[PDB]
Structure formats: C-alpha cells, structure tokens
C-alpha cells in the first residue's frame, strides 16, 4: 500500500457503501464542471478543488496561500488542501443516491 514495488498480493472484491465513503474525499452534488467566464472549477461540482485537490500547485481556490511553506494546511475560506496538483489524479469522490 506504500507503492514501493513490494507487493505480496493483490485482492479484489465487492465494494460496500462504507468502503465507497472511505474512498471518497468528499461528496459532489452539483452537475457543474467549469465556470464559463473565469475558466476555474466550480465549488461542489465535478471538478471541485475542495474535494479533488488544488488545480494549480501550492494554490488555494482564490489565492490566500501561494507558498510551499503552507504544507498540508487547508484554507479556511475555501477548504482546499495545499498540496501537489498531481493529487487531482488520486483523490476520489462519491455521490449519495436518493
């Protein structure tokens, strides 16, 4: 689970609601992808920074934090976590069905 190419086994199985919620870093509840004017991801949308990580490296939603010194501290105004934008390829979301 540490990605060190030392894998004793690889397991598959049915995923439950609890497992899906454990995987999810947040809940997406709006069918909006990108703002048509500012070209930035919308809040709580399919590309929400708060859920999936920052779009740009070491940057919050508006720019309150823009330095590498703010390591792993979420912005109070937005709620996004200041980390490498590559985490956008790893964080997973979920939706709650009626």
């Amino acid at each position: 689970m540490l990605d060190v190419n030392f894998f004793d086994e690889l397991r598959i199985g049915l995923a439950t609601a609890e497992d899906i919620r454990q995987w999810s870093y947040g809940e997406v509840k709006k069918p909006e992808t990108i703002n048509y004017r500012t070209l930035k991801p919308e809040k709580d949308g399919l590309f929400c920074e708060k859920i999936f990580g920052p779009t740009r490296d070491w940057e919050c939603y508006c720019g309150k934090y823009k330095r590498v010194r703010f390591k792993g501290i979420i912005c109070e105004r937005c709620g996004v976590e200041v980390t490498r934008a590559k985490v956008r390829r790893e964080r997973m979301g979920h939706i709650e069905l009626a």
Partner: protein, 175 residues
C-alpha cells in the same frame, strides 16, 4: 417556464447562466432570420446593430456559445484511434528543463558564494532562495542589525557588482 429554465440550466457541459443563454438564443434566431431575409449571412456589424449591443460583445457571445467535443470520439477516417491520443500534456514535466533548472540552481549558488557572505545573505533572503518567502527590507534590517537605508544601498551595490561581465556571460546561456 420549467422546461426552458431546466434546458438553460443543464443543456450544456459548461454551465451558462440563463441571462446569457437567452441572449445567445435570441442572437442565433435573429441571425438566421436576417440570413433568410437578406440571402447572405449577416455581418457582425449588422448583428451588433440588431442586438443594439457592441460588436465586441457580439463576438464574445459568439465565442461563448461554442460547445466542447468528445475526447474519445474517433478522429481517423476509419476507427483506429481517439482524439485523446492526439493531445499533449501541458502540465507534464519535460524532464530536460528540470535538469537545466537544477544546474542553474547549483551555478547560482556558486556565483553567490563568489561574493561576500554579507551581500550573499542579503540577496538570498531578499529574493527568497533559502525559503519560499522573499523577506522585506524591515525583515532583513531586523535580522541583520543594519539600517534599512544602508541595506538598500548595499543591495544596490551587490546587484551592480553582480551584473559584472563574467557572471553575466556565465548566466546568459541559462535563458
């Protein structure tokens, strides 16, 4: 009302507010009407006159009205590959500029070492090389026990002497 509002809200992949959807549809409708009337496609100036709005805004609306295309649609004449196989990665590391950057870092460190320790430190904490933050004149003054005016003078002198021919020639190629 409900059907039109829902269409404006959820029709496009990129959400467009109803205030802009209405003007987009109105512009398209009267543009087609003008084309039918005239026999030729109406010019942007004519469309702007009909809108009673500026041609710049007309063109902005026209470019806003565009919709995205599928990245997985077949691009070849036959079915061989998808459009997603033809698009590069802008944010990907090029693996050569990184080497150039680290060598530039080493060379800049060496060049700063050639100068005096006081001036090298002043430049380092002024431009934020040890850490991310570039410190202020008051900060460097309070950490070095020197007047801010004197620190400004020594920084200017350090910059002028760092503009010196050999250092400039050495750093020129890294650009």
């Amino acid at each position: 009302q409900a059907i039109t509002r829902a269409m404006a809200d959820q029709a496009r992949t990129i959400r467009i507010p109803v205030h802009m959807v209405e003007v987009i549809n109105k512009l398209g409708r009267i543009q087609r009407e003008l084309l039918q009337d005239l026999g030729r496609e109406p010019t942007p100036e004519e469309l702007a006159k009909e809108m009673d709005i500026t041609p710049e805004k007309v063109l902005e609306i026209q470019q806003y009205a565009r919709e995205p295309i599928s990245l997985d649609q077949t691009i070849g004449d036959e079915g061989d590959s998808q459009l997603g196989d033809f698009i590069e990665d802008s944010e990907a590391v090029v693996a050569v500029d990184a080497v150039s950057f680290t060598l530039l870092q080493d060379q800049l460190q060496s060049v700063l070492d050639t100068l005096s320790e006081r001036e090298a430190g002043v430049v380092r904490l002024r431009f934020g090389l040890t850490d991310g933050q570039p410190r202020t004149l008051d900060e460097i003054g309070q950490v070095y026990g020197v007047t801010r005016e004197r620190i400004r003078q020594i920084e200017s002198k350090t910059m002028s002497k760092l503009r010196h021919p050999s250092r400039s020639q050495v750093l020129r190629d890294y650009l």
